[PDB]
Amino acid sequence: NFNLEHPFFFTNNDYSTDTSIKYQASLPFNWHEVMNNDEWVYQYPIGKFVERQGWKIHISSEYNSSHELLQDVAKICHEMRIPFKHLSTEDKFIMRNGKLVSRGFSGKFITCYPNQNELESVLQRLESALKQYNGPYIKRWDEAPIYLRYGIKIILKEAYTGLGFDGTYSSEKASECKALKILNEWSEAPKIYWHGKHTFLGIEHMKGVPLNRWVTNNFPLYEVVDKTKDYLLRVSKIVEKLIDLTNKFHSENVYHQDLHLGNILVKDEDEISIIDWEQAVFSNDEKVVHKVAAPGFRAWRETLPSEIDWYGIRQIAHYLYMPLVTTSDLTYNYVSQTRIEGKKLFESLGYTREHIDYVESLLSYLDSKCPQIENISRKKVLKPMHEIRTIESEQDIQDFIIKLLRGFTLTYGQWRKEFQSRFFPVHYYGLNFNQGIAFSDLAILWSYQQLAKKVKNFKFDDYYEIRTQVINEAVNNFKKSSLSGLFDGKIGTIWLIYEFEIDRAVELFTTHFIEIFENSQNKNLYSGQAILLVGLYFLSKGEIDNKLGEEILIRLREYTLNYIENPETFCKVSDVQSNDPYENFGGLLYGHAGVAWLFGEAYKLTGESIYKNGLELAVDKELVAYKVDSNNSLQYSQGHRLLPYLATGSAGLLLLINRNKEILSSKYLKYLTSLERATDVVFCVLPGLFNGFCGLEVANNIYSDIDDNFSGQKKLIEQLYRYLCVIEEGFVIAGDNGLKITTDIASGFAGVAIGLVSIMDNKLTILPQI
Amino acid sequence: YNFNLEHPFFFTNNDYSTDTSIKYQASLPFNWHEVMNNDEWVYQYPIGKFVERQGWKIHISSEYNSSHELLQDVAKICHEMRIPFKHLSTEDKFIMRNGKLVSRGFSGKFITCYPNQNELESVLQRLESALKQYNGPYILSDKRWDEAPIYLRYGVFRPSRDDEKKVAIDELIVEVVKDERLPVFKIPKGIVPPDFLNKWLDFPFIIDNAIRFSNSGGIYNARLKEDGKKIILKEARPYTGLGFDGTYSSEKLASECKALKILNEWSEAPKIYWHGKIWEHTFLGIEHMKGVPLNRWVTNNFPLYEVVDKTKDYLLRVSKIVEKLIDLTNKFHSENVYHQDLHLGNILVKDEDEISIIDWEQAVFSNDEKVVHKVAAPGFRAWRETLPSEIDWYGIRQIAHYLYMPLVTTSDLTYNYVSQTRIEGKKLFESLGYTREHIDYVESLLSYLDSKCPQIENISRKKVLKPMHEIRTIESEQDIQDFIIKLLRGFTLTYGQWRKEFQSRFFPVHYYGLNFNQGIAFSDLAILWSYQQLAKKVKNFKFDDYYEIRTQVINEAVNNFKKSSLSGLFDGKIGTIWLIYEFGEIDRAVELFTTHFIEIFENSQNKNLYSGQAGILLVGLYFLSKGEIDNKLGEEILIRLREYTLNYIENPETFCKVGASDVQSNDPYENFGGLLYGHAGVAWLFGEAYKLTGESIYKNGLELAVDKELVAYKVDSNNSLQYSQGHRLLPYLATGSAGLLLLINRNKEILSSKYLKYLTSLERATDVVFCVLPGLFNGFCGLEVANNIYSDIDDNFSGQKKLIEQLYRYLCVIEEGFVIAGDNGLKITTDIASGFAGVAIGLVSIMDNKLTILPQI
Ligand SMILES: Nc1nc2c(ncn2[C@@H]2O[C@H](COP(=O)(O)OP(=O)(O)OP(=O)(O)O)[C@@H](O)[C@H]2O)c(=O)[nH]1
């Protein structure tokens, strides 16, 4: 679960390809170099009695004086004077030192391992080359960088720490204090209240909130908020304050170089306050590439410092129209599409035409300072969208899905050329779980063949040989890993192969079901034992061996009874604010809210009414966990994260409530239309099935009979157009936390694929029945 | 088929390669794309526009001094209307293709555009009128269009189309049209007349000899008219010829013209005759010298035998030439000229031992700088940015050390390689019998010369290859016991240094067999067989990791086993079965043998022991001699070997080629003849069959095999039998003479007394004091495994002593262990073809008396 990215695609930490300066050192007679740990090179003589542990000596230096210190230490230590190891990469030197890194290992550039009882002159000789150099502190021994071993009522700060890829220390970046002292006239900028040297310069804290919660409090997400319109008048007030103060402080030789979600702060009556003037450089003759900034805001390819801030001051006012800003690091000039997709939404709300046209003309004459920059790279293959249509007929939907299926083949094509480990592009969380109906290719292929089956007379190409050269390593790696479960576990592959090869899945299931089922302990649907769905699905049509079938049937009966006496125990029916799957709780993906499907299938099979009793017990244990929202409906309770979604929140609750009509009573149907009002929003900030808009639109209309749901296609496509970055004759959808492209079940090609095939075929084709 | 690629340590395949030059990037509007198809070009075409194949294309070239301006000056022309284009990616491929090491059929290819056939004049008039001040090379197999660089040709636009009939990707889509990519233009099967192009479409030297024609031309023999006499010509087209620096061909002929005009009173340096410029070419009239080079001078003068020196005085003949070289250094250094690249294709010695340095195509004229010796020879390549005067003196030093002993081919890999050679040279030159004054004078002049080239200490990561300064003599078995564990621990170090980075294979191999993976060849499993046969050979080993890697090599050498399709004993899917049998395991793959032995047998053509069915029959008779296969296939092997012998007896021409031929090479698939790669290994089957069955026809087949193999053996000046192809002699094991001595000496009682009299001549022929290669197929270790493998009496100690001493002459040292250098030594290879496993099985069979590489009875 770590992030390391190159342009265009996404990958893991294996793809580095470091190109820097090799360190290089000499070597005496009967000595050696070795790259043992692949991050340190170790020097050692041949014949010497090496002990274990003892003492270690650490020496740290600055960036510029590394190689001459290395030469002096080498000429001291090579002549029968102790083995030696050091850092092996100039590129990794700025991650070992510099800015905020891991607290356990920081510094420690030069290391030696003395032979216990010979230190009477080595430490004395190490002040010869030292005592005039420098370095970070990381315990002190003398007046030299020689060490021994066996953050942020005035808010303050702290000062060789903070080095980037260029030479700019955090103490150096002087710039902040000169920018504060030349801008002490205005109360929007903070004041300086401490001078001198670990230096402790302080600032005044202006009141306010960050603009993201201002967007969630002022930019509408439900239709009942912000009565009598007039929100665009406030938006005009903030952007007129930005243009006024921008023209006031760009008079005399000062620039900010970053105007992201930070450094802006609105208190009351639309009063901004720019804080933390830290990245202040100024020139107007040479051109500088924008080096360091927040994600979503990055200037391009060696322009003037007057127009570095141009893109930032355009975009900071641009996403106030409709906030989708984080995907501009991949698609240059992305923000044109947000304007035209916010204008139609604002007209659909019913705002005044004067306010909308004034805001559009205001952004137009801010764009009147318009220096495009024809950047020259390989990122420019993914050009923006400049065409917006309207869906009325079914052939438009067929054209959209045959366009979208091409982008899947195109994002498959470029992945195989430079990478060989997996078969398909990934998300950053589940980039190694290469099995099951989860973040894995085996769940991608059957969505592909389904949507090839649905549309029209598709080209057969060569996907037969592709499917067999996928299923060969699938049956190879059925068992060479750990864990168990349905989604990313063990026997989801059996269900997918049977839903794909019939006989092999049946005989692996009947030879491994009792062996794998007793190994797992939990009962949740992700990686537990509810497996019972696969067993009941194989039992209802009938392919299981008989006597083991009744044995596992009375087994699941007695675990159902045992669950009837005990509390929830295995899961919680969790005040953590995370998107993380293992930390997720209280949903259909994670919790006891999904066992209602398992109880309902057993009730639906012949006659078992103890599973009905399990249904009332499960819903009575599950209904307490949800808090109420403003619009009189149930909502997920933890933090300020009021997200009604398929997982955790309201949409999964509406899915589980309307699962079976026959089990319902008048006590159950007390929150039907209020919960439907909960899942009726004008904006979803991230797309997808598990954590996005597509799961909401699936849960809004799945089991309300009929098939003619063209309002559903209209709403889904006309709200899904805002998330797409176009390629040649196709689309590739950026996933959740979107900076790169993603193809998985949650946020990718397969999410939209499963969503559309579930809306067309109203059975929601995950966790099956019959 | 060769696939050579530079890499520090081990030389590998074309996979470790990253372009680190300034890349070329263009801009695209909407409805355009940037497909990167096949790693050379980047494809660009408007989206939705059907490109019409099978028309006319334009090749555009450029110079290195201004090429970006061609990109940003022709980009709006392709942006206007509809023109696809594809251009080269980085500057490194532009250097590699607009240079000197690339073929003339593919040179000058930078921009390729794709017009339609109906728009050619309209695009050509627009692009021609804006490129007046651009210029570049000619590009072969095209024709001149106007004055701007524009060259047309007939070529392939796209691959095969969507849903109609295609036959190829290169020919006419009308009869077959073969590709004729030669530096001429071809109009195939008449012409459909291009009305845009029909109007536009319509020396005091005599040629003597072309020694080369290279890429930029080069040295060209001819005859002058107004002066007569003999002359040579150097030619150089403008804007071609390019190193890894801004430097062209015409920037060096002017430099050597200056360097040969500044000095004129030296009779052994050539005099300029006519430095004229025909058209834009730079021709050059240079006189010719008589004589032979030093590279072939040591072939017939260095004592290879111990009688060939013709009554002493060889070292004085060395010393006069050496003092002639050391005299002619500061004579032209007074003019402050400097001549780089002092390799041994420039010092030519004529009659009465007079020298003449003839190649001057690198010449600086100032000395305060440190440059990389960028263009050099194999062996004389210098050591990272010293001043050019000591670069020249370093070249002089290694000239003198090749004159001392003729191995300097690996001095690029190990710094101060001259140390080991200078240590062994006194023992080489004192073991033959010479006066001490000559050796004293040679070492005195060398000890004068060695201090004018200053030593350096940086080495740059190849530090673990140190020269050897700790030599010993062999007079006890404990020396052999120490050497075997040292070599084995060095092989462990080799596996440790190979396991770090690469994983496509398991062991380092020579670059000939860089793709093969099985058998007693360039492989993996035979190396562990040698490892096991040497590890328990003394008493034991530590065995830190041998068990799990043995399990690994068997369960991914046996699991696939059929991915490649090739037959033979050496590398051909049945030697794999033999190594599984002889590793110490159970017979195991006998089921696979009975499954597909007839299938492997029935679909092969060659019958040599390298990759033919003769080794398959040897494996079969070995398994029948072990005593358990089946009741039926044992009869099938005999009923096939019967009439396999008879097709050879009635017609020996099909199974092998007799004669000497005209081939000077080292590739394993070319050199016919000899014990392994030819005819002399056929009689090994007849010997094994006679030792199993005992009947006369096998003996007669062996006698005819020995009779018809000895045709291609030319007698030396001394009484010695030598294998000879071309102008070279081959007294080696594989394609040589020591292979026949095994066949004669092993079957001594079977053979009659008529063929037993050749042993006294082949013992003289396989007795040299010097070799150039440290190997056993084609090297040294095979020449003294034939000496003591089957005598009668156990006298292993003296032969072992000689082998270990001359291997100390050839080895290289890492840590406490040891490595060895393979064929074409610039690297470290560990296999059974001039590697660690070969010297391992040599040290096995030198006292075990078996020669375990070939399966006996
Ligand atoms: N000057 C001269 N050259 C000859 C003679 N005979 C052959 N040559 C040619 O000189 C060439 C020397 O080429 P190399 O030794 O490869 O060196 P080079 O290719 O000239 O490159 P540089 O050594 O950098 O000039 C040979 O390839 C021969 O073709 C001769 O008598 N005199």
The upper half-sphere exposure of residue B604, i.e. CA atoms within 13 Å in the direction of its Cβ, equals 25
Residue whose CA is at the smallest distance from ligand 1 atom 15: B345
Expressed in angstroms and rounded, the spacing between residue B203 Cα and the centre of ligand 1 is 24
| Token pair belonging to A369 | 């300072």
Bridge partner residues of B728 (DSSP): B725
Q: Judging by DSSP bridges, how do beta strands B338-339 and A634-636 pair with one another?
A: unpaired
Element (H, E) at B497: helix B477-499
Residue of A nearest to B469 (CA): A29
CA–CA distance, B217 with B137 (Å, rounded to integer): 14
- Widest CA span in chain A: 91
| Reduced 3-state DSSP string for A45-71 | ECCCCCCCCCCEEEECCCCCCHHHHHH
Bridge partner residues of B23 (DSSP): B90
Q: Within chain B, which residue ranges are assigned CATH 1.10.510.10?
A: 310-470
- Cα–Cα separations (whole angstroms), residue B718 to A180, B289, B761, B763: 97, 33, 10, 13
| Radius of gyration (C-alpha) of chain A in whole angstroms | 31
CA–CA distance, B575 with B613 (Å, rounded to integer): 11
CA–CA distance, A626 with A637 (Å, rounded to integer): 6
Residue of B nearest to A37 (CA): B500
Sign of dihedral through CA atoms B160, B161, B162, B164?
Answer: negative
How far is the alpha carbon of A30 from chain B, nearest alpha carbon, in Å?
7
| Reduced 3-state DSSP string for A105-117 | CCCCCEEECCCCC
Q: Within chain B, which residue ranges are assigned CATH 3.30.2430?
A: 1-202
| Token pair belonging to B337 | 């000229």
| Radius of gyration (C-alpha) of chain B in whole angstroms | 32
CA–CA distance, B834 with B828 (Å, rounded to integer): 10
- In this structure, the number of other CB atoms found within 10 A of the CB of residue B772 comes to 12
How far is the alpha carbon of A34 from chain B, nearest alpha carbon, in Å?
9
- The 8-class DSSP code of residue A29 comes to T
CA–CA distance, B489 with B495 (Å, rounded to integer): 10
Amino acid at A226: D
Bridge partner residues of A592 (DSSP): none
CA–CA distance, B84 with B92 (Å, rounded to integer): 24
- Start-to-end CA span in chain B (Å): 37
The SS3 assignment for A41 reads strand
| Token pair belonging to A738 | 């979107």
Q: Judging by DSSP bridges, how do beta strands B57-60 and B713-715 pair with one another?
A: unpaired
CA–CA distance, A700 with B676 (Å, rounded to integer): 78
Amino acid at A339: R
The CATH code belonging to domain B1-202 is: 3.30.2430
The SS3 assignment for B309 reads coil
CA–CA distance, A470 with A452 (Å, rounded to integer): 18
CA–CA distance, B58 with A754 (Å, rounded to integer): 49
Determine whether the interchain pair A33/B815 forms a contact, defined as Cβ–Cβ distance below 8 Å. Answer: no
Nearest to A321 by CA among A366, A255, A273: A366
Residue B87: φ, ψ to 5°: -130, 165
- Neighbour-count burial of A434, counting CB atoms closer than 10 A to its CB (0-12 exposed, 13-18 middle, 19+ buried): buried
Determine whether the interchain pair B466/A29 forms a contact, defined as Cβ–Cβ distance below 8 Å. Answer: yes
Q: Judging by DSSP bridges, how do beta strands B347-349 and B355-357 pair with one another?
A: antiparallel
Expressed in angstroms and rounded, the spacing between residue B384 Cα and the centre of ligand 1 is 25
CA–CA distance, B239 with B320 (Å, rounded to integer): 44
CA–CA distance, B715 with A57 (Å, rounded to integer): 72
| Token pair belonging to A3 | 């992030």
Tell me, rounded to whole angstroms, the distance of Cα A40 from its chain centroid. Answer: 32
How far is the alpha carbon of B817 from chain A, nearest alpha carbon, in Å?
11
CA–CA distance, A385 with A727 (Å, rounded to integer): 9
What are the chain A neighbours of B815 within 8 Å (beta carbons)? Answer: 32, 46
| Token pair belonging to A187 | 């109360």
- In this structure, the number of other CB atoms found within 10 A of the CB of residue B11 comes to 21
Bridge partner residues of A155 (DSSP): A203
The SS3 assignment for B466 reads strand
Tell me, rounded to whole angstroms, the distance of Cα B496 from its chain centroid. Answer: 26
- Contact assessment for residue A57 and residue A147, using Cβ atoms and an 8 Å cutoff: yes
Q: Judging by DSSP bridges, how do beta strands B355-357 and B338-339 pair with one another?
A: unpaired
CA–CA distance, A526 with A486 (Å, rounded to integer): 6
Expressed in angstroms and rounded, the spacing between residue B219 Cα and the centre of ligand 1 is 7
| Token pair belonging to A42 | 């170790």
- Contact assessment for residue A452 and residue A753, using Cβ atoms and an 8 Å cutoff: no
Residue of B nearest to A32 (CA): B464
Residue B698: φ, ψ to 5°: -65, -40
The SS3 assignment for A284 reads coil
CA–CA distance, A686 with A427 (Å, rounded to integer): 14
- Cα–Cα separations (whole angstroms), residue A544 to A479, A503, A549, A608, B610: 21, 11, 6, 20, 56
For B715-740, letters b (16+ CB in 10 Å) and e give ebeeebbbbbbeeebbbbbbbbbbbb
| Phi-psi sector, B793: left (phi>0), alpha (psi -120 to 50), beta | beta
Domain spanning A31-149, CATH architecture: 2-Layer Sandwich (3.30)
Residue whose CA is at the smallest distance from ligand 1 atom 27: B212
CA–CA distance, B241 with B248 (Å, rounded to integer): 5
Expressed in angstroms and rounded, the spacing between residue A76 Cα and the centre of ligand 1 is 49
The finding on whether B75 has its CB within 6 A of some atom of ligand 1 is no
Documented resolution in Å:
4.0
The finding on whether B359 has its CB within 6 A of some atom of ligand 1 is yes
Q: Within chain A, which residue ranges are assigned CATH 1.10.510?
A: 222-275+284-378
How far is the alpha carbon of B151 from chain A, nearest alpha carbon, in Å?
28
Q: Within chain A, which residue ranges are assigned CATH 3.30.2430.10?
A: 31-149
- Contact assessment for residue A346 and residue A682, using Cβ atoms and an 8 Å cutoff: no
Expressed in angstroms and rounded, the spacing between residue B214 Cα and the centre of ligand 1 is 11
Amino acid at B635: E
Sign of dihedral through CA atoms A200, A202, A208, A214?
Answer: negative
- Contact assessment for residue B759 and residue B742, using Cβ atoms and an 8 Å cutoff: no
- Contact assessment for residue A498 and residue A537, using Cβ atoms and an 8 Å cutoff: no
What residue ranges in A565-671 does DSSP mark as E strands?
Answer: 626-628, 634-636
CA–CA distance, A665 with A655 (Å, rounded to integer): 16
CA–CA distance, B820 with B830 (Å, rounded to integer): 8
Element (H, E) at B111: strand B111-113
Element (H, E) at A695: helix A693-700
Determine whether the interchain pair B18/A17 forms a contact, defined as Cβ–Cβ distance below 8 Å. Answer: yes
Bridge partner residues of B667 (DSSP): none
- Contact assessment for residue A352 and residue A300, using Cβ atoms and an 8 Å cutoff: no
Q: What share of chain B is helix, strand, coil (3-state, %, to 5)?
A: 30, 10, 60
Q: Which of A24, A300, A331, A421 is the mutation pick for testing B, counting most B CBs within 10 A?
A: A24
Determine whether the interchain pair B25/A378 forms a contact, defined as Cβ–Cβ distance below 8 Å. Answer: yes
Residue A267: φ, ψ to 5°: -95, -60
CA–CA distance, A261 with A259 (Å, rounded to integer): 7
Determine whether the interchain pair B464/A32 forms a contact, defined as Cβ–Cβ distance below 8 Å. Answer: yes
CA geometry: angle A5, A10, A15, nearest 5 deg: 60
CATH superfamily, domain B310-470, is: Transferase(Phosphotransferase) domain 1 (1.10.510.10)
CA–CA distance, A404 with A415 (Å, rounded to integer): 17
Substitution candidate for ligand 1 out of B219, B233, B242, B255 with most atoms within 8 A of CB? B219
Substitution candidate for ligand 1 out of B359, B362, B364 with most atoms within 8 A of CB? B359
The finding on whether B459 has its CB within 6 A of some atom of ligand 1 is no
Expressed in angstroms and rounded, the spacing between residue B359 Cα and the centre of ligand 1 is 6
CA–CA distance, A542 with A536 (Å, rounded to integer): 9
* No. of helices (H) and no. of strands (E), chain A: 24, 10
- Start-to-end CA span in chain A (Å): 38
DSSP secondary structure string, B221-243? EEEESSS-SEEEEEE--TT----
CA–CA distance, A634 with A615 (Å, rounded to integer): 20
What are the chain A neighbours of B463 within 8 Å (beta carbons)? Answer: 27, 33
CA–CA distance, B131 with B123 (Å, rounded to integer): 13
CA geometry: angle B488, B490, B492, nearest 5 deg: 75
Amino acid at A195: H
- Cα–Cα separations (whole angstroms), residue A127 to A132, A143, A145, A767, B53: 9, 9, 9, 70, 75
The SS3 assignment for B60 reads strand
Long-range Cβ pairs for the range A258-261 (8 Å, 24+): A258/A293, A258/A294, A258/A297, A258/A312, A259/A297, A259/A309, A259/A312, A259/A313, A259/A316, A260/A293, A260/A294, A260/A296, A260/A297, A260/A312, A260/A316, A261/A210, A261/A211, A261/A212, A261/A294
DSSP secondary structure string, B705-720? HHHHHTTSEEE-SSS-
DSSP secondary structure string, B626-686? HT-S-SSHHHHHHHHHHHHHHHHHH-TTTT---S--S-----TTT---SSSSSSTTHHHHH
CA–CA distance, B447 with A532 (Å, rounded to integer): 88
The CATH code belonging to domain A222-275+284-378 is: 1.10.510
